[PDB]
mmCIF file of N, CA, C and O in Angstrom:
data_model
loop_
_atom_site.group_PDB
_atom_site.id
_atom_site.type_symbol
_atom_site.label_atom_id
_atom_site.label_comp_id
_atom_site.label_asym_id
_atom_site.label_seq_id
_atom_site.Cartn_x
_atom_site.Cartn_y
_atom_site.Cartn_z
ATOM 1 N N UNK A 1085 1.942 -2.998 -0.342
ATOM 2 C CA UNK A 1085 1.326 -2.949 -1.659
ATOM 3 C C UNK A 1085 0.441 -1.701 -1.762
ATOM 4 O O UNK A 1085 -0.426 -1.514 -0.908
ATOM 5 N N UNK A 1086 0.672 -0.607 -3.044
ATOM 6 C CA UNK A 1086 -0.261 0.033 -3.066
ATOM 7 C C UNK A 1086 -1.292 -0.352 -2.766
ATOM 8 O O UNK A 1086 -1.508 -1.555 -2.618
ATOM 9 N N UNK A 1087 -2.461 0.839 -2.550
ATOM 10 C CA UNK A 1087 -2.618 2.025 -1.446
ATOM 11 C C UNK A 1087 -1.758 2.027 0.067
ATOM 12 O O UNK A 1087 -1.366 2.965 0.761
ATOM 13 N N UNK A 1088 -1.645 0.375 0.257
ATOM 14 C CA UNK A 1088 -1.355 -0.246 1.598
ATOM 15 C C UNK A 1088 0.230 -0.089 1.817
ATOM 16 O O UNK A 1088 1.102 -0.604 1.116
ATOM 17 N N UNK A 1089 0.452 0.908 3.181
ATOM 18 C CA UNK A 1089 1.956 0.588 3.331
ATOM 19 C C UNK A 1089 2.493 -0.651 3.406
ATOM 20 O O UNK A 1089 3.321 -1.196 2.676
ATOM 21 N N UNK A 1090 2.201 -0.850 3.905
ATOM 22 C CA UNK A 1090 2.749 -2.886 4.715
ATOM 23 C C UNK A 1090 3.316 -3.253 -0.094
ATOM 24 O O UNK A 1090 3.689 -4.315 -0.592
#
């Protein structure tokens, strides 16, 4: 999920 890779 944006910012978050994953």
């Amino acid at each position: 999920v944006f910012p978050i890779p994953x």
